[PDB]
Design an enzyme around this catalytic site. Sequence first.
Site, PDB file in Angstrom:
ATOM      1  N   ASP A 292     -32.984 -27.899 -16.383  1.00  0.00           N
ATOM      2  CA  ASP A 292     -32.747 -26.713 -17.192  1.00  0.00           C
ATOM      3  C   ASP A 292     -32.127 -27.115 -18.530  1.00  0.00           C
TER       4      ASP A 292
ATOM      5  N   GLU B 178     -29.030 -26.483 -21.381  1.00  0.00           N
ATOM      6  CA  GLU B 178     -27.712 -25.947 -21.684  1.00  0.00           C
ATOM      7  C   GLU B 178     -27.368 -26.286 -23.123  1.00  0.00           C
TER       8      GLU B 178
ATOM      9  N   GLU C 295      -4.837 -28.514   1.658  1.00  0.00           N
ATOM     10  CA  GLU C 295      -5.498 -27.319   2.166  1.00  0.00           C
ATOM     11  C   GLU C 295      -6.669 -27.668   3.076  1.00  0.00           C
TER      12      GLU C 295
ATOM     13  N   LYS D  39      -7.644 -27.011   7.211  1.00  0.00           N
ATOM     14  CA  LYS D  39      -8.891 -26.387   7.641  1.00  0.00           C
ATOM     15  C   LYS D  39      -9.587 -27.206   8.724  1.00  0.00           C
TER      16      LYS D  39
HETATM   17  N1  LIG Z   1      -4.616 -13.479  -8.578  1.00  0.00           N
HETATM   18  C1  LIG Z   1      -5.649 -12.475  -8.914  1.00  0.00           C
HETATM   19  C2  LIG Z   1      -6.531 -12.993  -9.887  1.00  0.00           C
HETATM   20  O1  LIG Z   1      -6.854 -14.462  -9.518  1.00  0.00           O
HETATM   21  C3  LIG Z   1      -7.740 -15.151 -10.466  1.00  0.00           C
HETATM   22  O2  LIG Z   1      -7.817 -16.530 -10.080  1.00  0.00           O
HETATM   23  C4  LIG Z   1      -8.551 -16.726  -8.960  1.00  0.00           C
HETATM   24  C5  LIG Z   1      -8.975 -18.209  -8.895  1.00  0.00           C
HETATM   25  O3  LIG Z   1      -9.265 -18.720 -10.247  1.00  0.00           O
HETATM   26  C6  LIG Z   1      -7.883 -18.798  -8.397  1.00  0.00           C
HETATM   27  O4  LIG Z   1      -8.185 -20.011  -7.829  1.00  0.00           O
HETATM   28  C7  LIG Z   1      -6.972 -20.761  -7.644  1.00  0.00           C
HETATM   29  C8  LIG Z   1      -6.976 -21.920  -8.639  1.00  0.00           C
HETATM   30  O5  LIG Z   1      -6.913 -21.415  -9.953  1.00  0.00           O
HETATM   31  C9  LIG Z   1      -5.790 -22.884  -8.443  1.00  0.00           C
HETATM   32  N2  LIG Z   1      -6.017 -24.060  -9.272  1.00  0.00           N
HETATM   33  C10 LIG Z   1      -5.637 -23.330  -6.987  1.00  0.00           C
HETATM   34  C11 LIG Z   1      -5.587 -22.139  -6.038  1.00  0.00           C
HETATM   35  N3  LIG Z   1      -5.468 -22.624  -4.660  1.00  0.00           N
HETATM   36  C12 LIG Z   1      -6.837 -21.249  -6.186  1.00  0.00           C
HETATM   37  O6  LIG Z   1      -6.691 -20.172  -5.281  1.00  0.00           O
HETATM   38  C13 LIG Z   1      -7.918 -19.663  -4.810  1.00  0.00           C
HETATM   39  O7  LIG Z   1      -8.867 -20.751  -4.482  1.00  0.00           O
HETATM   40  C14 LIG Z   1      -8.625 -21.448  -3.133  1.00  0.00           C
HETATM   41  C15 LIG Z   1      -9.756 -22.244  -2.813  1.00  0.00           C
HETATM   42  N4  LIG Z   1      -9.317 -23.580  -2.453  1.00  0.00           N
HETATM   43  C16 LIG Z   1      -8.425 -20.355  -2.051  1.00  0.00           C
HETATM   44  O8  LIG Z   1      -8.055 -20.981  -0.825  1.00  0.00           O
HETATM   45  P1  LIG Z   1      -8.803 -21.151   0.531  1.00  0.00           P
HETATM   46  O9  LIG Z   1     -10.129 -21.786   0.871  1.00  0.00           O
HETATM   47  O10 LIG Z   1      -7.744 -21.577   1.669  1.00  0.00           O
HETATM   48  O11 LIG Z   1      -8.916 -19.570   0.782  1.00  0.00           O
HETATM   49  C17 LIG Z   1      -8.422 -19.026   2.000  1.00  0.00           C
HETATM   50  C18 LIG Z   1      -9.322 -17.867   2.378  1.00  0.00           C
HETATM   51  O12 LIG Z   1      -9.369 -16.930   1.304  1.00  0.00           O
HETATM   52  C19 LIG Z   1     -10.720 -16.606   0.965  1.00  0.00           C
HETATM   53  N5  LIG Z   1     -10.937 -17.069  -0.433  1.00  0.00           N
HETATM   54  C20 LIG Z   1     -10.500 -16.370  -1.496  1.00  0.00           C
HETATM   55  N6  LIG Z   1     -10.818 -16.982  -2.659  1.00  0.00           N
HETATM   56  C21 LIG Z   1     -11.481 -18.110  -2.349  1.00  0.00           C
HETATM   57  C22 LIG Z   1     -12.088 -19.211  -3.134  1.00  0.00           C
HETATM   58  N7  LIG Z   1     -12.038 -19.205  -4.488  1.00  0.00           N
HETATM   59  N8  LIG Z   1     -12.686 -20.212  -2.453  1.00  0.00           N
HETATM   60  C23 LIG Z   1     -12.729 -20.215  -1.109  1.00  0.00           C
HETATM   61  N9  LIG Z   1     -12.197 -19.249  -0.339  1.00  0.00           N
HETATM   62  C24 LIG Z   1     -11.566 -18.173  -0.881  1.00  0.00           C
HETATM   63  C25 LIG Z   1     -11.620 -17.312   1.964  1.00  0.00           C
HETATM   64  O13 LIG Z   1     -12.054 -16.359   2.935  1.00  0.00           O
HETATM   65  C26 LIG Z   1     -10.736 -18.362   2.606  1.00  0.00           C
HETATM   66  O14 LIG Z   1     -10.995 -18.503   4.005  1.00  0.00           O
HETATM   67  C27 LIG Z   1      -7.372 -19.384  -2.429  1.00  0.00           C
HETATM   68  O15 LIG Z   1      -7.273 -18.360  -1.370  1.00  0.00           O
HETATM   69  C28 LIG Z   1      -7.659 -18.714  -3.688  1.00  0.00           C
HETATM   70  N10 LIG Z   1      -6.448 -17.836  -4.047  1.00  0.00           N
HETATM   71  O16 LIG Z   1      -7.331 -17.759  -7.248  1.00  0.00           O
HETATM   72  C29 LIG Z   1      -7.672 -16.553  -7.644  1.00  0.00           C
HETATM   73  C30 LIG Z   1      -8.485 -15.818  -6.579  1.00  0.00           C
HETATM   74  O17 LIG Z   1      -7.724 -15.674  -5.395  1.00  0.00           O
HETATM   75  C31 LIG Z   1      -7.214 -15.095 -11.856  1.00  0.00           C
HETATM   76  N11 LIG Z   1      -6.040 -16.060 -11.952  1.00  0.00           N
HETATM   77  C32 LIG Z   1      -6.759 -13.743 -12.277  1.00  0.00           C
HETATM   78  O18 LIG Z   1      -7.926 -12.895 -12.510  1.00  0.00           O
HETATM   79  C33 LIG Z   1      -5.874 -13.072 -11.283  1.00  0.00           C
HETATM   80  O19 LIG Z   1      -4.672 -13.835 -11.176  1.00  0.00           O
HETATM   81  N1  LIG Z   2     -17.538 -22.785 -22.940  1.00  0.00           N
HETATM   82  C1  LIG Z   2     -16.273 -23.547 -23.069  1.00  0.00           C
HETATM   83  C2  LIG Z   2     -15.310 -23.059 -22.163  1.00  0.00           C
HETATM   84  O1  LIG Z   2     -16.026 -22.661 -20.844  1.00  0.00           O
HETATM   85  C3  LIG Z   2     -15.125 -22.142 -19.803  1.00  0.00           C
HETATM   86  O2  LIG Z   2     -15.908 -21.717 -18.671  1.00  0.00           O
HETATM   87  C4  LIG Z   2     -16.490 -22.733 -17.978  1.00  0.00           C
HETATM   88  C5  LIG Z   2     -16.921 -22.207 -16.587  1.00  0.00           C
HETATM   89  O3  LIG Z   2     -15.976 -21.175 -16.124  1.00  0.00           O
HETATM   90  C6  LIG Z   2     -18.125 -21.664 -16.815  1.00  0.00           C
HETATM   91  O4  LIG Z   2     -18.892 -21.589 -15.674  1.00  0.00           O
HETATM   92  C7  LIG Z   2     -20.092 -20.823 -15.912  1.00  0.00           C
HETATM   93  C8  LIG Z   2     -19.927 -19.479 -15.194  1.00  0.00           C
HETATM   94  O5  LIG Z   2     -18.845 -18.760 -15.743  1.00  0.00           O
HETATM   95  C9  LIG Z   2     -21.195 -18.604 -15.261  1.00  0.00           C
HETATM   96  N2  LIG Z   2     -20.993 -17.394 -14.472  1.00  0.00           N
HETATM   97  C10 LIG Z   2     -22.398 -19.362 -14.698  1.00  0.00           C
HETATM   98  C11 LIG Z   2     -22.606 -20.669 -15.460  1.00  0.00           C
HETATM   99  N3  LIG Z   2     -23.786 -21.358 -14.915  1.00  0.00           N
HETATM  100  C12 LIG Z   2     -21.355 -21.578 -15.429  1.00  0.00           C
HETATM  101  O6  LIG Z   2     -21.663 -22.705 -16.233  1.00  0.00           O
HETATM  102  C13 LIG Z   2     -20.936 -23.864 -15.904  1.00  0.00           C
HETATM  103  O7  LIG Z   2     -20.953 -24.113 -14.449  1.00  0.00           O
HETATM  104  C14 LIG Z   2     -22.318 -24.582 -13.930  1.00  0.00           C
HETATM  105  C15 LIG Z   2     -22.216 -24.960 -12.566  1.00  0.00           C
HETATM  106  N4  LIG Z   2     -23.351 -24.412 -11.842  1.00  0.00           N
HETATM  107  C16 LIG Z   2     -22.762 -25.786 -14.800  1.00  0.00           C
HETATM  108  O8  LIG Z   2     -24.085 -26.152 -14.415  1.00  0.00           O
HETATM  109  P1  LIG Z   2     -24.740 -27.273 -13.553  1.00  0.00           P
HETATM  110  O9  LIG Z   2     -24.514 -27.464 -12.072  1.00  0.00           O
HETATM  111  O10 LIG Z   2     -26.309 -27.464 -13.868  1.00  0.00           O
HETATM  112  O11 LIG Z   2     -24.062 -28.510 -14.329  1.00  0.00           O
HETATM  113  C17 LIG Z   2     -24.849 -29.400 -15.116  1.00  0.00           C
HETATM  114  C18 LIG Z   2     -24.036 -30.664 -15.347  1.00  0.00           C
HETATM  115  O12 LIG Z   2     -22.706 -30.318 -15.749  1.00  0.00           O
HETATM  116  C19 LIG Z   2     -21.740 -30.928 -14.900  1.00  0.00           C
HETATM  117  N5  LIG Z   2     -21.156 -29.868 -14.038  1.00  0.00           N
HETATM  118  C20 LIG Z   2     -21.349 -29.722 -12.712  1.00  0.00           C
HETATM  119  N6  LIG Z   2     -20.673 -28.648 -12.229  1.00  0.00           N
HETATM  120  C21 LIG Z   2     -20.022 -28.086 -13.266  1.00  0.00           C
HETATM  121  C22 LIG Z   2     -19.118 -26.927 -13.460  1.00  0.00           C
HETATM  122  N7  LIG Z   2     -18.775 -26.132 -12.420  1.00  0.00           N
HETATM  123  N8  LIG Z   2     -18.659 -26.684 -14.708  1.00  0.00           N
HETATM  124  C23 LIG Z   2     -19.001 -27.463 -15.752  1.00  0.00           C
HETATM  125  N9  LIG Z   2     -19.806 -28.539 -15.646  1.00  0.00           N
HETATM  126  C24 LIG Z   2     -20.339 -28.895 -14.454  1.00  0.00           C
HETATM  127  C25 LIG Z   2     -22.480 -31.944 -14.048  1.00  0.00           C
HETATM  128  O13 LIG Z   2     -22.399 -33.217 -14.691  1.00  0.00           O
HETATM  129  C26 LIG Z   2     -23.920 -31.471 -14.066  1.00  0.00           C
HETATM  130  O14 LIG Z   2     -24.848 -32.554 -14.098  1.00  0.00           O
HETATM  131  C27 LIG Z   2     -22.774 -25.452 -16.247  1.00  0.00           C
HETATM  132  O15 LIG Z   2     -23.178 -26.667 -16.989  1.00  0.00           O
HETATM  133  C28 LIG Z   2     -21.476 -24.989 -16.719  1.00  0.00           C
HETATM  134  N10 LIG Z   2     -21.616 -24.478 -18.163  1.00  0.00           N
HETATM  135  O16 LIG Z   2     -18.835 -22.682 -17.886  1.00  0.00           O
HETATM  136  C29 LIG Z   2     -17.874 -23.180 -18.626  1.00  0.00           C
HETATM  137  C30 LIG Z   2     -18.004 -24.699 -18.693  1.00  0.00           C
HETATM  138  O17 LIG Z   2     -19.066 -24.997 -19.579  1.00  0.00           O
HETATM  139  C31 LIG Z   2     -14.318 -20.982 -20.288  1.00  0.00           C
HETATM  140  N11 LIG Z   2     -15.197 -19.739 -20.306  1.00  0.00           N
HETATM  141  C32 LIG Z   2     -13.717 -21.171 -21.641  1.00  0.00           C
HETATM  142  O18 LIG Z   2     -12.551 -22.044 -21.499  1.00  0.00           O
HETATM  143  C33 LIG Z   2     -14.643 -21.755 -22.660  1.00  0.00           C
HETATM  144  O19 LIG Z   2     -15.679 -20.811 -22.947  1.00  0.00           O
HETATM  145 MG   LIG Z   3     -27.586 -26.475 -15.508  1.00  0.00          MG
HETATM  146 MG   LIG Z   4      -6.348 -22.008  -1.630  1.00  0.00          MG
END
Ligand SMILES: NC[C@@H]1O[C@H](O[C@H]2[C@@H](O)[C@H](O[C@@H]3[C@@H](O)[C@H](N)C[C@H](N)[C@H]3O[C@H]3O[C@H](CN)[C@@H](OP(=O)(O)OC[C@H]4O[C@@H](n5cnc6c(N)ncnc65)[C@H](O)[C@@H]4O)[C@H](O)[C@H]3N)O[C@@H]2CO)[C@H](N)[C@@H](O)[C@@H]1O
Ligand SMILES: NC[C@@H]1O[C@H](O[C@H]2[C@@H](O)[C@H](O[C@@H]3[C@@H](O)[C@H](N)C[C@H](N)[C@H]3O[C@H]3O[C@H](CN)[C@@H](OP(=O)(O)OC[C@H]4O[C@@H](n5cnc6c(N)ncnc65)[C@H](O)[C@@H]4O)[C@H](O)[C@H]3N)O[C@@H]2CO)[C@H](N)[C@@H](O)[C@@H]1O
Ligand SMILES: [Mg+2]
Ligand SMILES: [Mg+2]
Lengths: 253, 253
Positions: free
Chosen positions: A50, A52, A145, A149
């Site tokens: 794709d 980007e 974490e 799990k």
């Molecule tokens: N607070 C409200 C809202 O939250 C927004 O931010 C999001 C997200 O960006 C953020 O992720 C956290 C990271 O930024 C940080 N670096 C580390 C934290 N641990 C993150 O917390 C969230 O992601 C982890 C995933 N490792 C979740 O933990 P886990 O797998 O144990 O989850 C336990 C059970 O909960 C369910 N669950 C809910 N969210 C998730 C995600 N993202 N992945 C996988 N599972 C998830 C699931 O059923 C699972 O069994 C952790 O629970 C989660 N809190 O966290 C919040 C979303 O919660 C913005 N900051 C802002 O809009 C605002 O503050």
């Molecule tokens: N723009 C600058 C900066 O971006 C910040 O936001 C981040 C991130 O939150 C955001 O994610 C996008 C989503 O919000 C949107 N709903 C869907 C998009 N597709 C997301 O784009 C980014 O995440 C995807 C992951 N599927 C990346 O694509 P892909 O798997 O094909 O990756 C291609 C190559 O890039 C590397 N890679 C792999 N995984 C990731 C992730 N998760 N993030 C970034 N790079 C990744 C790897 O080498 C692979 O070969 C997609 O490229 C990526 N754009 O997107 C941006 C990061 O660009 C904030 N919004 C803000 O701080 C500011 O705007």
């Molecule tokens: Mg891509």
């Molecule tokens: Mg967590």
Amino acid sequence: MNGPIIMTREERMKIVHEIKERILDKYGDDVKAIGVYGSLGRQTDGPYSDIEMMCVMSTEEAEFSHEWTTGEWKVEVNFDSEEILLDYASQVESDWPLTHGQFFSILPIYDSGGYLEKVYQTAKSVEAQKFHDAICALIVEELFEYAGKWRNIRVQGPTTFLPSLTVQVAMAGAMLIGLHHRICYTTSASVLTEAVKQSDLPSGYDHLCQFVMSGQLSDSEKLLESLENFWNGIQEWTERHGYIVDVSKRIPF
Amino acid sequence: MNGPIIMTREERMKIVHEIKERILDKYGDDVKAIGVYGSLGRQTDGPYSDIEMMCVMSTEEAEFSHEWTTGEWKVEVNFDSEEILLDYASQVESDWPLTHGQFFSILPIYDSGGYLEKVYQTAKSVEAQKFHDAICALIVEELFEYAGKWRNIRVQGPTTFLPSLTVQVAMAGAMLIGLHHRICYTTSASVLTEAVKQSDLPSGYDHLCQFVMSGQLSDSEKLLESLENFWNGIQEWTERHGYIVDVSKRIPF
Ligand SMILES: NC[C@@H]1O[C@H](O[C@H]2[C@@H](O)[C@H](O[C@@H]3[C@@H](O)[C@H](N)C[C@H](N)[C@H]3O[C@H]3O[C@H](CN)[C@@H](OP(=O)(O)OC[C@H]4O[C@@H](n5cnc6c(N)ncnc65)[C@H](O)[C@@H]4O)[C@H](O)[C@H]3N)O[C@@H]2CO)[C@H](N)[C@@H](O)[C@@H]1O
Ligand SMILES: NC[C@@H]1O[C@H](O[C@H]2[C@@H](O)[C@H](O[C@@H]3[C@@H](O)[C@H](N)C[C@H](N)[C@H]3O[C@H]3O[C@H](CN)[C@@H](OP(=O)(O)OC[C@H]4O[C@@H](n5cnc6c(N)ncnc65)[C@H](O)[C@@H]4O)[C@H](O)[C@H]3N)O[C@@H]2CO)[C@H](N)[C@@H](O)[C@@H]1O
Ligand SMILES: [Mg+2]
Ligand SMILES: [Mg+2]
Ligand SMILES: [Mg+2]
């Protein structure tokens, strides 16, 4: 739609430059720079890849994106102010080794004053302390974490989640290694291959990756043993390298 | 750290209430509500489960968290202003089925006056159009993207990424099903188990999930064939349910 089609680099660049001119047509003088990902210094693409692109905008607070498909290919264009983009390029999150390699392969196709080179230089010059902070955070927020799990799976199931969890743990281990060595992996697909090539790996990581890379994830007893061995290796490896997680507070506020 | 220890629900709830009292002492009248979510707010927590808490603050723009370990257990407490939290609870992203179950399983442990009910009502009242848009975005941003990745692997490798990619595709399919049926999965471990129990599965999805749930991910030819079959099933399923991705624009802006 039949999904992504085969295209040559030349066919993709034709599409890229059409988008470039349309960006200039629509947004005009508000465009500071336009770049295409994966096109500077490299071709790690593929026939089905794709497109980007990134656009540096002069408008303060600009932060939007367009992501779409023609049915035959897919495009993502992110539009950011210079300040927002430079801030993002200097932040080191847990998945920095996965995400920020893109900043070294952006091909500028329009730039009215060195903006993409400034982003490249900003991404390349990040403070070593930031990697230490990110590693300590990853250990708590991801690895600890995950250990809970898989220990839950050991005592109460479900083992049907163990293959997916093991994949996730291997990827988190690759982030840990990438942060330690300050390595940005080339592609998503090369993360594990490049991670296991690095020196000074936590003990048990390479054994865990053998299951994930070979896809032999059906022996739950072996996976749990390998996960515990990797977790022990993390303890020795972080202690040895001084990535000391603060465990001294019941409540840190 | 020795990793997470076994704890009983009673031991975990004692810690929760200790944290509650410390939150009220430190942040005082700006705390509007404190809740416990995850499987502890649901009283199905596992022996090794971590602790997740949420705080509603009156402080404008408040958005921070404390995430730490004692070496024996791990806690995450998120602090958000009411406006920020209600906005987050009403946004439907691709991973809404994974993240937003928190808002339907809140165990209140402090509330100054119906704040946690307002959060639940905001999460429960989201307009159907937002789920339609999220599904169409998921198809483009995730599934179409994944199709390019495995079609590249078919022609140029590396097959060592195929087990991990297949896990990711199965998870994305589970998100699609969760959005369609308005399901928030109870735990990350139960996502695939609950996804394949739903009605109206896209053709090929259950077959793909069997590889991921059994951990039999070593037959690259079978995985690639199953991924293509699932991709075809997605096309038939979205057309039947009216989730039509716009393909009529080479550049949509
Ligand atoms: N607070 C409200 C809202 O939250 C927004 O931010 C999001 C997200 O960006 C953020 O992720 C956290 C990271 O930024 C940080 N670096 C580390 C934290 N641990 C993150 O917390 C969230 O992601 C982890 C995933 N490792 C979740 O933990 P886990 O797998 O144990 O989850 C336990 C059970 O909960 C369910 N669950 C809910 N969210 C998730 C995600 N993202 N992945 C996988 N599972 C998830 C699931 O059923 C699972 O069994 C952790 O629970 C989660 N809190 O966290 C919040 C979303 O919660 C913005 N900051 C802002 O809009 C605002 O503050
Ligand atoms: N723009 C600058 C900066 O971006 C910040 O936001 C981040 C991130 O939150 C955001 O994610 C996008 C989503 O919000 C949107 N709903 C869907 C998009 N597709 C997301 O784009 C980014 O995440 C995807 C992951 N599927 C990346 O694509 P892909 O798997 O094909 O990756 C291609 C190559 O890039 C590397 N890679 C792999 N995984 C990731 C992730 N998760 N993030 C970034 N790079 C990744 C790897 O080498 C692979 O070969 C997609 O490229 C990526 N754009 O997107 C941006 C990061 O660009 C904030 N919004 C803000 O701080 C500011 O705007
Ligand atoms: Mg891509
Ligand atoms: Mg967590
Ligand atoms: Mg957790």
